[PDB]
Amino acid sequence: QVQLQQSGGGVVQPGRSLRLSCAASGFTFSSYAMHWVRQAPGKGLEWVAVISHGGSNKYYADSVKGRFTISRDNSKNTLYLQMNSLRAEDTAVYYCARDFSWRGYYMDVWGKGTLVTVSSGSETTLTQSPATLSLSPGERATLSCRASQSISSYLAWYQQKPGQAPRLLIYGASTRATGIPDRFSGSGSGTDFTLTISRLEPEDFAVYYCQQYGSSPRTFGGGTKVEIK
Amino acid sequence: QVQLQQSGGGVVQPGRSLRLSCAASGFTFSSYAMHWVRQAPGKGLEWVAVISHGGSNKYYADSVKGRFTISRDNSKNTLYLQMNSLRAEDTAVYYCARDFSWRGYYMDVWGKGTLVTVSSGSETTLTQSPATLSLSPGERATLSCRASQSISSYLAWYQQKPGQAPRLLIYGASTRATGIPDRFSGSGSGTDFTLTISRLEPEDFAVYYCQQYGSSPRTFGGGTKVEIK
C-alpha cells in the first residue's frame, strides 16, 4: 500500500544543521507535490514548506523562510528538508505529507513523523518595584530591588536619562560614585535593596536599574521609571 | 577626557553577520575589563558579554552564548562584538561599557550606543472555536472555522487521533474524502466554515484542524479537541 518512511530525527544544539528524509513508495512520487508540516509538543499543526512535483517551484512559511530548504530526488523517491540555523522554537514533530495532486493545495497521505529537539546551549533574577513612580520635584523617591538569591551587598545602581547612555550612581549598594550628589543613597544587604532619592531635582526624573555581581552571569533589574505628575 | 566612540550599527536581515566597534581613548585600555550591554527599543537593559583586560577570559549571557563573540585589540584600543546567526529579538541599541576595574563587576563609562535592527525576512488566519468540546458518544459535535479573508470554499478538514499522524476528512469544505463515513459533514463558504460529526463514535474523539488553500502561504487553524465527559 501507499507508504512514507521517515528518518533523521534527534537532538541537536542551537545553530547547528539537521536534514530529514521521507522515503516514498506505493505511488508515482514524481507526479505529486510534497509537504512538510511540523507540530511542537502540545500545540497545533504548523505548515512548513511545499515543493512542486518536478522540484522547480518551492514555497515556505514566513517563520522558516531563508534558513529552511525543501528538496527532492525523484530517482531516489525521497523528500528532504534541510534545517539550518536552528532556534529553540523549531522543536517539533516533523511530518512529511503527500499532496492530493500536483497542485499543492491539501495533503491526503501523511508520514508517521520524527521528533526533533533543539536544546540546550542557576541565574540570579533581580525584580524592581514599582514599575513606574509618579512624583513632583521636591518629593522623595523610594525604589526596591529584590534578588532571587543572596548577593551579599554586591549590587550597583544605574541612572538612565531618556535618549542617553546609563550612568553609574551606586556601587556595592552603599557607596556613592564620584560626581553623584548625596541626595542619592543606596541601602540594603542579602536579597533586599533600596535606592532613595531625597528632594527630587528635574534632572533626577529618569529610569533606574539595579545590577548584581555576586553571581555569574551579571544580571540587571527590569527598571523603575521615575516620572512627573 | 575619557571617551568611547561607537560604530557599525545598521539594518540587516535575519541569519546574516554584523560586527560592532568601540574605539577607546582617555584611559589605559589594556588594564580594564570590557562590557557589551543591549537595550531593545522600549524595554530595559540586557547584559550581553564581558572580556578580561588581557582578553584571555570571555563570558556571555545565556541568550547570546554560542553565536555571539567578544574580542579586543589592545594595540588598536578597540573592543569588538561579532554577531552571528541574528534573530529578530536581537534588535536593540548596543552599548559598549568600560568596567570599573579589571574585575568585570560593574561599569562606570558608557558609549553612546549604536542602533541595530534585524528585519524583515498578507496571510489568511484561521480561527477555530471552541478550543475544547466535552461530549458523550452518540452526541453531535459542531466545530467552527473562521478565515480572516474570504477563501471561496477552498478549505480542508483534518482529524488527528492522539499520538498519530493527521488524516484528511474533508476537502473543498463540502466533499468527503474516500474512506470517511457520512456522519462527518463539512459546510460553509467565504469566511464561515463548519464541521459536523453526527452520532459520535469512540474513534471520533480527536483533535480537528481546518486548513485553507485560497491564498499563499497555506495555513492551519489552532485546532478543536473533541473529548469525552
Numbering used by the authors:
A (entry chain A), B (entry chain A): 1 to 121, 127 to 234
From the study:
Lack of non-toxic inhibitors with defined mechanisms of action poses a serious obstacle to therapeutic interventions for diseases caused by aberrant connexin hemichannels. Here, we report the identification of a human recombinant antibody that perturbs hemichannel function. Each scFv of human immunoglobulins is formed by a heavy chain variable domain, VH, connected by a linker to a light chain variable domain, VL. The antibody we selected is not toxic to cells, reversibly inhibits hemichannel currents and strongly reduces the activity of some Cx26 hyperactive mutants.
For antibody discovery, we screened a single-chain fragment variable (scFv) combinatorial antibody library expressed in phage. The advantage of a synthetic phage library is that it enables full control over the in vitro selection process, allows to obtain highly functional binders rapidly and at lower cost, does not rely on adjuvants which can unfold proteins, and may contain over 40 billion highly stable human antibody clones. Connexins are post-translationally oligomerized to form hexameric assemblies, known as connexons or hemichannels, prior to membrane insertion either within the endoplasmic reticulum or in the trans-Golgi network. Unpaired connexin hemichannels in the cell plasma membrane are kept in a predominantly closed state by at least one of the following mechanisms: (a) pore occlusion by mM levels of extracellular Ca2+ and Mg2+; (b) negative membrane potential; (c) post-translational modifications (e.g., phosphorylation). Open hemichannels lack ion selectivity and mediate autocrine/paracrine signaling by the release or uptake of small molecules including ATP, amino acids, reduced glutathione, NAD+, prostaglandin E2, and cyclic nucleotides, which are critical for cell-cell communication and the regulation of inflammatory responses. Of the thirteen dominant Cx26 mutations responsible for KID/HID syndrome (G11E, G12R, N14K, N14Y, S17F, I30N, A40V, G45E, D50A, D50N, D50Y, A88V) at least eight are thought to translate into hyperactive or “leaky” hemichannels (G11E, G12R, N14K, N14Y, A40V, G45E, D50A, D50N, A88V) that do not close correctly in response to extracellular Ca2+ or show an altered permeability to this critically important cation and second messenger compromising cell viability in vitro.
